[PDB]
Structure 1
């Protein structure tokens, strides 16, 4: 009854004068992940994952 899994609610965000600069050369960059949710039953659940080379 009233089960809740991986939930995000009641989020208030204010950004006035944010300045974000990203310079990438042959890699991986993850920025600005806000108010996200997921649900993985049989598998790998990654949020904001970065890998450079294999």
Structure 2
């Protein structure tokens, strides 16, 4: 492999924008919760995963 004159963008995330005004979030009775916003994962060579969101709960009342 060789690159003489070149621009290579491999495994890239850019220009991700989030805008929010007058919003409302309520999680009332949750055993375990994962609430997130932007999640950016850039990776050229991987063996596992990129983003893992796990939630295991128990709401007995």
Q: Count how many residue pairs are aligned between Structure 1 and Structure 2.
A: 54
Q: Which is greater in Rg?
A: 2
Q: Distance in 1 between matches of 2:37 and 2:14?
A: 18
The root-mean-square deviation of aligned C-alpha atoms, in Å, is 3.8
CA change 1:14–1:28 in 2 (3 A) is: closer
What is the TM-score normalised by the length of structure 1? Answer: 0.44
Does the 8 Å contact 2:13/2:42 carry over to 1? yes
List gaps (5 residues or longer) in structure 1.
none
Q: Distance in 2 between matches of 1:51 and 1:40?
A: 30
Q: TM-score, structure 2 length as denominator?
A: 0.42
Unmatched tracts of structure 2, length 5 or more: 1-5
